Amino acid sequence: QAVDETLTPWTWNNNNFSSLKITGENPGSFGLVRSQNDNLNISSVTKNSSDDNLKYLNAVEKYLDGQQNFAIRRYDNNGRALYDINLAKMENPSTVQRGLNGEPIFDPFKGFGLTGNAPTDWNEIKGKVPVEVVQSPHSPNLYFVLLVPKVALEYHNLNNQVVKESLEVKATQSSFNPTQRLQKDSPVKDSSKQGEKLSETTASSMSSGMATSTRAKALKVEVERGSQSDSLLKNDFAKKPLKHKNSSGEVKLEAEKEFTEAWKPLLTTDQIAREKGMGATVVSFYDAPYSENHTAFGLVDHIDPKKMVENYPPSWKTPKWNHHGIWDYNARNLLLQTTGFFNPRRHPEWFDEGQAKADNTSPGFKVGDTDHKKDGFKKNSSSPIALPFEAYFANIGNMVAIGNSVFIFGGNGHATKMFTTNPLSIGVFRIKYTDNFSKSSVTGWPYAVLFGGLINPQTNGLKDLPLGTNRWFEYVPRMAVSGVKWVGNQLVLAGTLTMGDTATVPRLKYDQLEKHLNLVAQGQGLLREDLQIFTPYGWANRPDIPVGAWLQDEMGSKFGPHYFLNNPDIQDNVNNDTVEALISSYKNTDKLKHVYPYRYSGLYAWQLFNWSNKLTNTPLSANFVNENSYAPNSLFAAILNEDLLTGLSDKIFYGKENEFAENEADRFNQLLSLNPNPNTNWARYLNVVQRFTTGPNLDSSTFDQFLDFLPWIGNGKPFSNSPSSSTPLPTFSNINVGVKSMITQHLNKENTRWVFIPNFSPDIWTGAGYRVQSANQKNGIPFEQVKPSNNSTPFDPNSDDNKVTPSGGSSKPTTYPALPNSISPTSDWINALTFTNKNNPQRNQLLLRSLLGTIPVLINKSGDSNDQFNKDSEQKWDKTETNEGNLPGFGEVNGLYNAALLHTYGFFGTNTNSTDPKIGFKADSSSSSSSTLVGSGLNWTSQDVGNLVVINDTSFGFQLGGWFITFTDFIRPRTGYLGITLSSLQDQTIIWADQPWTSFKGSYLDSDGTPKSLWDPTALKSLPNSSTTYDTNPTLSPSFQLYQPNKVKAYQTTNTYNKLIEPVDATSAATNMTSLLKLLTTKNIKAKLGKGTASSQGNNNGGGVSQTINTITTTGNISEGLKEETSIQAETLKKFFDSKQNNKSEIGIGDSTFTKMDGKLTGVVSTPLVNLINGQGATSDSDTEKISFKPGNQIDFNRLFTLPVTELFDPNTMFVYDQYVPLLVNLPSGFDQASIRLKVISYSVENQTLGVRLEFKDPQTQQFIPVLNASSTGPQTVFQPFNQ
Amino acid sequence: IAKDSDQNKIDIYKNNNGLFEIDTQLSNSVATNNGGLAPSYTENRVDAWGKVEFADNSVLQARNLVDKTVDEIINTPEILNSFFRFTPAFEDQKATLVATKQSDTSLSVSPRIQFLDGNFYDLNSTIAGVPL
């Protein structure tokens, strides 16, 4: 019962909770505490090979019940402890007794009535640890707490052969090579089945057209049901003339021949539901600080996984299938990718068998039989989506209460995350109370249906992000959650979010996988990276051509009229005479569709603009969805309908309107949208979000200018490079990169003089790596870059395959008049969607990953002997027209520029270290060459998100790795304000750590009016092994990936970037690049940068407090950098930033101030007046010392009680009248008697007894507070005529 | 107001955080008018008029209100709200006691209660001039 000082306060990694501020009738704090003791040898709980995990996990809970203690003590309003609440050990546990109307029986001095018996399931709740606490908004003295098994804390301290990574490290006895794990071999035309290809259109309907050509016609696709019981009559989408390679057996996804010891959950969703000790629990409870019966329980609820999993959409029963079905399934399996939308090869955390089902087989549909008419029918599923142990505790934490209900939005996932395993919050639980809190109910739902109402009007940031959905919930949003809180009147959510997969919307031609190893590895789950990568030379003409159509030019000798390689210059010209042969005749029907004889082409932005799951102006509209992200790749914050979250029913009902088509005849004429059925309710849940935000309130290239303005945390230098001939270039924006020229020669050669720039000359900067005939001929290029297919001569213009014959006999060649000046991934073209590479998804992806500082760089050369690359005499910033500018042209991260990023990281030159590290990239014309991506040297990740904190009625922010971020204007936007502020940490001992987020101890609001955070450089620990006996090249760690070799042909010595750079067979390339394979592990990068050991210097200890930058109403006003009247908005913002590079704090950008403390930092507990560190920092409350209730020997009872107590107070409000205050309370000389009064809390007139509590004006605040020193019974007392 | 078959039926829909749902108990409470224009009053039931329990007469002696006169009490509506305990049928439904002098020594009280439409009804209420 009474306080034990041996338990000390702490912060859980998954929600960053440590205390709740109590509010209303009796203020104070609840906070988590644990035993201080060291030497916790969990590895002593031995695991045998012959049994399952459950008896081991129960033995670990039984061991932790002996080795540690945990509790939830109450504190007063100044942080003095009151009572202990060790839930495993407290005396005489009971539920609260009720009246017939459901109300708890209570009287403040006595406390609650206790029934004398514990709640339900007490024999298995007593082993659980509490991890989050909240208060009822409408009911007095009523609170809620969330509890979990202690393994949900100790998960990283359990032994390493059971708590494994999702990928093996291997013994490397043959030396390391990242290509050995990759399934790589490309498919081929079937030697015995060539003839089943789509038929050419033998005659084509006129449609009142007139023109003609010599070229081959469109290909027919037909589907119809027939009369047979298990077959169609036609099904041309299900044709299969391609088959997989044989290379010592068939190449396919086949988990049992790859995973010899397959990674699996600690427990399955059907175990956690039934083993009631391993599921999470919420309980209601009642508390009062100064009663005899001070605490007792309400009711108990299980956070049962089945109450979430049975509320998954119907398609989540078949995650290997999607609404495009048979052709998309085959195209993905031919490219060795994940089929459907959620399979375990990428996402094993949500599947009960983990990696052991990492295959495309048996997708819940009949596929792979001997006849295309026999495939394409619904059947039994092989593996549904579940909620296993790792994903389950990532879906636990971040509570809020609304009306008669309470919620769980899930954590950041640091309960259960591992270096190759990414569990997240996938939705929200709700617990609801009924019959005046006599009964309760529990439920949950995924974010996929709750976010279904998102549209472009609901954000002040960029538009068209990959957040859209349709009648099938195949888009699956999930989050690392920062929290949910009240911002004044508005309920708000914050965290980091998964978009749809932006890296695989462009798609390969079928044969070329052996020269594209990273692009397939990024789809295979072997490389768990979400960034977009420049790869255009190997893409097909459209992502959506069916597999029966591909085999129409195996030689390449016609440049594949229906299907060929994506080069932008050699697209077929529609002109206007051309259309009648290529599209303006081929009408579709209720059983007939066509594949056109037209060479479609375009770069990364045109690919995403057509086939990404983009937002639009109306809900459920997005007919295209690709795949779902590995990790969070967006910032996210939102305003919620707190009313609708309270009003929605517990059970969601889906129906046949959310099912996939039962057979392919219903897939051919597939309905895009439907009304809800009379029994269903899923459409009600779509509208829980009012508004959302994703980054700065900036538009177009202006957003890339902000990306260049912020400092890199590894060196304090902005990516814009301007604050110091032969000077370096920026990475994100195009301003001052290459040279200016007028766009007057591009595409249509029209409108540019008056409807593009505010000025008479249409100037745009041509960017890094560009094509021109001469330095004088700087505007446009003609169709001079004609290209051969093999050695078989050029593209053949004025040839009869590239001509048409309309009426009158006039004819002309089907090609461009003039073209854009650059194709590089940095491109930012306003006029040319088919040549621009920057996109709004990539802008938001780069914003997040440049804050965490973990954008990768492409390398040929390391700091090792004879392997070096130089800052000088080897790079030419003034000559971007040639190979001496070192622009890669393949394998580069989209939107940015690699050599600039390498300069900002300081991988070459003395920028980051006292001597030149000599690491980098070079373009050579003398020989064939090899490269790989490598990490930045930093180990932060997008799941490193901390507490949401609210500063006032409109401003809020959160910790995100080494940053604090504030969304100051989201509730009330303004013109000329960017909407964001940022503060960076400075300490090199934290920033260069190996698992850096483990040093963050929590973030909090402080009573001087600022957010603050705690750090401890003594809190870091080593990796799961110390290499022990062998050269660990693949050290599994939070920034490591299995990046593959890229192999590339020699660069041209002049006019280097006039064509796309050509890759070659990389399948043996690893032998030439062993230094780069050693440089994949971040510790080896840090060692060559001089950061890997004690040479980092600074403070040896130095834990303490961090604080965000100062702010005023002017902070973030950039109105002179916004709008235009002479030029392009990014360029005037660049001018506005250049004079402010040394003065970033008025933009709201800077470094957090810091102060050191003595000893360890373990956590904080918080009050409305003060914050306590490790539970210390309390004070005597010196302004209140002179206020006290009169003692019983100083009461003249006849003066008080000749009148009944019935009229000492106003019946409308229960405050005692002023005349009785100095008769009951002592006060100092000169005191303001209007500043204090008494509130009645219980009474009875037949006993003449009056019970009261005192409230006084806070000297610091426009609000009243209790006076806790006022008596031996605290701020509460009773008075009566001697009959006590 | 609807017909299932051919007679008219009264359903009450209650707004729950922006979404209206049928309230079957309030529907039955409102529809039980017994041929009158308005829902029945039952002493022992939380009906459309909530539920009103009067204090015993013995409250006057206990609280020393016998020393107050009828005119005092009658002009002290907070005293005469202490003459009943009210249970609302729907949240924030309100009720007061109207007092009437009966003798030198006695008064009567009669509840004034809000219906679903936000309006108060009592013994003298009309619609279209017709006493309810």
Ligand SMILES: [K+]
């Ligand atoms: K009644």
